[PDB]
Symmetry: C4
Subunit: 364 residues, 4 copies
């Protein structure tokens, strides 16, 4: 399992798996340019709420890694930069540290170095059907003094991953619902590159889930990562993974689906957010914050100052989109004028997303 | 006419005629990803009914060959693997064996080696206007102890094939309707690479036909095969065949057309089914089972263990698609959520396929 | 005289067929019928062309004439058309109204094709330049024509180095008067840029009932004149280039004319290159399919080349009828189609109600 | 400073910034061909009104340059040819000449050499928030005896330009409105490559602005120009500019939006007008006149006779479109039949541009 954590980072960082045969549908979203913005750049306010805390920018780093010391040093760099910028940070799956106690430090370092920002713990849905419960959740949370815990959905990844098994019985949701009653922090349910649909969002909501992270297709392709792991071990599933490279809900469509089917959700729009303009689009479309993982990893590996430059660039690009839409603050961005075209439009139409009611929901 | 059988197999197996200038429209069908499936992979049930028998997977091998001993050995390999996997198998046109009695064994071997699975006999619609009747149908059936007989439509192929004629007078259907009253097994009407429209489906239904096999364009291109036979004999029809390479109803559209216009039909979706994902899409769209021919031929030529690996891959991919849509069984897959986009959408719209009533009919 | 030779040479040997243009015929699909309900041998391709019967619903539209080498091309086309029972238009006869030595290069057509419909040809601009009844009667008598086509070519005239585009309404007043005295009917045809519903309705309001779409996507006359311009260092060349995709695509023109004048007799032409294109043109609303350029190219190759060409067109037409369950031309006109993509958006923007369209193209 | 002025001309003239990663959407507009025009070429009348003057062609040169003598000599060439053709001419931003008095001659030369055509002064909207007022406007106007003054919107350019700031407080519009009461000539508000939306047009109209110049995306890409200036000085904003290369309202969409949202506006359609056919399309879509800048610059640099040939070509192409549309004059062109397809069609639909009421407004 420890080797898999390193192999994941190495394939994501150095192989060709970002947007491989997949699409966010964000090219189908246009933010309407305002030649008279009505504001000045210096007055743009990017602050927003993240549960009980305030954050500096409506962007987060979503969970990636942890489990060995070299992974901990990646976590350390991301956490210290995130703290500097006032940006929330999720950690990778903490399964490895619930088991092997030597793996705990590679997660705990995050809170040592980032005492103020929201920190989000991480466990997988399949562990709920395998005997994780309240205590494991509390241990994941306490380990980093987390402000929330993300529970990940990754059935696509599990199906193609060489080492077993995709298990998603409804009992897991009953358990999740029970756990949420005893926990002192909120639960976020996030996908892992394949996106959340309205049926999935409504099912989760019916069990008390109110916080969602789209992780749609078009960014890091987890089916591709497992495909590569399969190719590497001469596992025949590789050719089957290849047929599923474009499987999933595109990020842009997932954001629309979650916002429309659960209008009061707190929503992270993620999966292929690569610029402050993507982030601006995600928010205008209906997300409360934009999430990123892969490009943060790649910069962090390059080093601290590379990662600081990366965030400087994201933030500037976000502010430029706010400036050029006349959005003085995040709230104004959420209601700014957009155009939806092409395949995203056809997707919304077939799925019964009445654009008229969509407009009202995304902006009230 | 025996060596036409050989030439067909050789061109299909070794020339470039799969999907040549043609399209299934299956790229316009998306199965909606469910990040919380509600099931586990191991509980997925792929069993379904095929007339009076149960089959293990909702997939069949459609009719191809027979007529000489080398063709019989291909039939033998396919039949033994299909028996092993619990998959129905059609044989190729049995005309050759109604005439030449030496050709009978190359069909009969199928039932010797596959005693339990449904086996489907095969005769051509033109033979009905050329003097075939009850006795020839009963002989075709008895020869392999068939559980059904497929009657093929191939006017496109006949038009471009160097040797003779396209004959499809309505008298053939009168005869077919009479024969169906005396036969102890059901009749399936199948196309052969060019697809079944609603006009054709309704006409066949008005003569008592209830079982259809779409064989749409986008897979094996029979116009291309005959084009190649023409090029080879310096026949001028070759250039004309080239103008018709994209002629026919795409598989996806044919499935919609048959299901919509004959809502209670038993429906095989075929013509360019190349993965278990294609098979999942065909079923979700409205078929009861997915049919395949060419890729089974190519693998069978490679050998028994190649064909076994092929089916293992198809079945895995089908189950992956079911897993990732939350479909515990074939019935759930038939009603799972989809998106229809692009040209298939415009096709449906022009043809008056009301998507609202469409969604209703396919989900039953 | 020399323009006439240059036109044939550029059309035949330069790259001007469908150059930056489109028929929109790729947006039309004929619905395949796996049970046709007919046999190939019973397919009947006969149809009416005014007072005559023709063997196939296809015509050769007007191209050339004016010198003896052009007459020998006309002769080859006419003799093959006669053999196949196919109507033939000749090129503009202006040259032969003027120069009397040019008459034989047109007259040869009737000598060699005594039974098929033969269609005379004069340009609409000539009506504002003094041509009238007598010139029309001369063009007709010269080949014992069964009809006369009057061509519209303002686009060609705008970019052609030598002079002017003149289309005052007076021309139509004159045309209407002429039609009262003439013993054969008038067809109005374009020349590569298509007939719109505004143009069709205007012509209909002056008594014109016979149209030939000659839409964009086939022979590109703006391109031909662009080439003549490039050759003489004329600056208009670069401007012609900007207009290479100007005009109504053939498929859209057929829809527009059939829709806006439901009882018209309609030739669908401009980029018809196969019997499948011909089948589509007819299913879409034309009564017959016209061709020019590919007949020219084959004729230049020779008699037997042109015979093989027609054999191919006819087989391809019959294949589409077979595969559509169309026993005759009338059944083809009502066969099931799908319209997609840009043609669909064109019709929508133009207010072509598809529901009423279907009714009109069928009845 | 003043060499930013020369650097702009140099990059625009000699680098690849025309339509870079951007689009006018003019390919989605088709003028319907009329095979019987009902006119002759020689009777086509291209005259139209430009405020209190008559002009020979419905085309103008929009503002570009001025500030140094070499820039003045470009202005001189453009002005003398515009005078010869009866075409209105805008000058570039006159800020430089309000400040440095040595820069005045490079603007004044325009009126010396073009005594009769409309000449349009130019000042930036940002200068209104930076203390420019009535006197600066009157000085800009008097310096060239202007018949109007254009106030330019360029927040996109300012955001990416290395030297300083985007400031667009509503106070500027209050000031602009006050200034317009004291001015003896009308105000045009123009963009600068990124286009005017309906929200921006309605806001300006609410402050008394009735004259608009779209300057949509698809022509000169000002974000690209500044990107290049950034690349040249190793400024990190370069990579961010690259993410915004396709930002803005396309010219064709901007024409539709301004005509639709302010039906009585006097409207210049500009941003990527490169031929008389583009000019014809812009007018048929709803503009009163077509504007051009970059191609006029490029020809002017080549010299007087190159620029004369350029206009000869534009005018011929415009008349060809009028001829082939049966438009005897500019008024008939404004109501000629068109087709709108593709992305422009989807843009208008999403933005609630009812095509039925649209046709009425552009024709009346
Ligand atoms: C499915 C992924 C997993 C589950 C672990 O599998 P198992 O080994 O079965 O876990 P175990 O059995 O419990 O040990 C790993 C994950 N770590 C992970 C590694 C790296 C390197 C990349 C790039 C991304 C993620 N993300 C997805 C990101 O958070 C984003 O949502 C996504 O990448 C889209 O954003 P984009 O990258 O900006 O386009 C993860 N998400 C998680 O929820 N948990 C994690 O641990
Ligand atoms: C028209 C085709 C014929 C009729 C025989 O012609 P005639 O010689 O006139 O018969 P006669 O006069 O009676 O002697 C041959 C056929 N054999 C045949 C051979 C090979 C090698 C392949 C690949 C395809 C088929 N299929 C089509 C397949 O079953 C599928 O429908 C199709 O391939 C789409 O699925 P994909 O392959 O997955 O894309 C046949 N269909 C049949 O109904 N009968 C047959 O005998
Ligand atoms: C505008 C064209 C003219 C007018 C002559 O110009 P002027 O010199 O002004 O004549 P004058 O001043 O009066 O002496 C020439 C034309 N001859 C002609 C030459 C060649 C070689 C080809 C290929 C095409 C045509 N066609 C168009 C064809 O009939 C078809 O409509 C068209 O080609 C689309 O079908 P596709 O080729 O199958 O794609 C003609 N159309 C005519 O009506 N008259 C003719 O004389
Ligand atoms: C925003 C533009 C500016 C601001 C100056 O920057 P600052 O230094 O901030 O100004 P300061 O601080 O006040 O000194 C420069 C501009 N000059 C200018 C230079 C050249 C060389 C080109 C090609 C074009 C423009 N245009 C836009 C053109 O008129 C067209 O609208 C546009 O090009 C689309 O039409 P297409 O070229 O046909 O595609 C100008 N527009 C203006 O309103 N003012 C000008 O000074
Ligand atoms: Mg896991
Ligand atoms: Mg046969
Ligand atoms: Mg002429």
């Amino acid at each position: 399992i420890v080797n898999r954590k390193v192999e994941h980072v190495e394939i994501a960082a150095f192989e060709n798996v970002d947007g491989l045969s997949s699409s966010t549908f964000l090219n189908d979203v246009i933010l309407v340019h305002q030649g008279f913005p009505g504001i000045s750049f210096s007055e743009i306010n990017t602050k927003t709420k993240f549960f009980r805390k305030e954050i500096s920018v409506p962007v987060m780093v979503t969970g990636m890694t942890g489990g060995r010391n070299e992974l901990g040093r990646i976590n350390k760099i991301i956490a210290e930069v995130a703290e500097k910028f006032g940006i929330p940070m999720g950690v990778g799956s903490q399964r490895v540290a619930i088991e092997k106690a030597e793996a705990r430090e590679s997660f705990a370092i995050v809170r040592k170095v980032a005492p103020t920002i929201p920190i989000i713990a991480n466990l997988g849905m399949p562990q709920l059907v395998k005997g994780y419960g309240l205590k494991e959740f509390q241990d994941a949370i306490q380990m980093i003094e987390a402000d929330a815990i993300a529970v990940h959905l990754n059935p696509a990844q599990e199906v193609f991953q060489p080492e077993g098994e995709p298990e998603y019985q409804i009992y897991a949701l009953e358990k999740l619902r029970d756990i949420s009653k005893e926990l002192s922090v909120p639960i976020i349910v996030k996908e892992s590159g394949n996106g959340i649909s309205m049926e999935t969002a409504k099912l989760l909501y019916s069990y008390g889930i109110k916080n969602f992270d789209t992780s749609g297709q078009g960014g890091t392709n987890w089916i591709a990562i497992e495909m590569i792991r399969d190719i590497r071990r001469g596992n025949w599933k590789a050719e089957s993974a290849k047929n599923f490279l474009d499987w999933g809900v595109p990020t842009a469509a997932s954001i629309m689906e979650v916002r429309y089917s659960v209008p009061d959700s707190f929503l992270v729009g993620s999966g292929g957010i690569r610029s402050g303009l993507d982030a601006a689009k995600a928010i205008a479309l209906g997300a409360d914050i934009a999430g990123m993982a892969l490009p943060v990893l790649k910069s962090a590996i390059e080093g601290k100052e590379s990662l600081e430059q990366f965030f400087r660039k994201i933030i500037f690009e976000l502010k430029a989109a706010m400036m050029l839409t006349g959005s003085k603050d995040v709230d104004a961005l959420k209601k700014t004028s957009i155009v939806i075209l092409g395949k995203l439009k056809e997707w919304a139409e077939y799925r019964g997303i009445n654009l008229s009611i969509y407009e009202k929901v995304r902006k009230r």
